[PDB]
Ligand SMILES: O=C(O)Cc1ccc(O)cc1
């Protein structure tokens with residue numbers, strides 16, 4: 001259930017902490033936008049493997065104190081604070097989408113505590129050599145990233161206009177709000193329990209405004225503060241060919257730059273469907289790093 005953790009710099013983090021109380025932590029880094037609202041399918045898959053699912057809202061999402069100017073790597077301060085709260089020597093970590101860079105960061109910060117990374121449709125570094133980051137992206141994401149590069153003053157009112165349609169959205173509302181970004185396989189994923197969980201995640205992400213979404217976007221268009229080459233632990237990398245939010249080429253790029261990577265490039269899968277259908281295979285590979 002939900003708890004609050006005070007960090008050393010005086011911030012509060014909203015933390016969703018599952019049992020089992022003695023399990024190895026699985027730290028799940030949420031997407032952009034996203035929050036500490038667990039996906040029930042991920043809870044069931046984690047508990048089946050004896051993993052203790054832990055997620056926190058990144059600064060500015062939900063009731064987590066905004067931390068303006070944060071880089072991707074600054075999230076690893078909170079990884080360390082959370083694992084110290086749990087008294088956990090070792091963990092595995094997973095990140096989806098905007099969570100992918102943050103999951104990798106924790107591995108670089110804590111190379112002897114993080115055993116392995118699961119990176120699901122993770123976004124590539126903004127200066128990724130030889131990659132056109134915006135190529136294959138849905139036009140909503142091209143617009144958002146172009147505003148992010150231009151700065152907070154133009155990005156904020158854009159995100160506030162998008163948030164109008166998403167802050168109270170049910171699953172149908174999330175589909176309507178992401179029109180350019182979802183292929184049919186992703187729309188089909190946002191039904192039933194997964195859709196309810198993702199919509200609840202989106203509502204909590206936007207409950208106190210767009211600050212977490214804004215600060216994530218601004219972080220993704222600057223230096224992460226580390227390179228994928230610095231991630232020494234095994235990475236299980238997954239990417240859908242039909243993803244319009246993080247194009248296939250981003251996962252191909254990350255797979256080429258990570259030193260120890262199992263790469264899975266799934267035909268017919270999008271940004272949402274990749275995680276939903278492959279969760280058992282993803283967690284089997286992650287747990288094998290322990
Ligand atoms: O792409 C992401 O990182 C964010 C996202 C969040 C909720 C959702 O329903 C779809 C996408």
Ligand SMILES: [Cl-]
Pocket residue numbers: 024049050051287
């Ligand atoms: Cl285990």
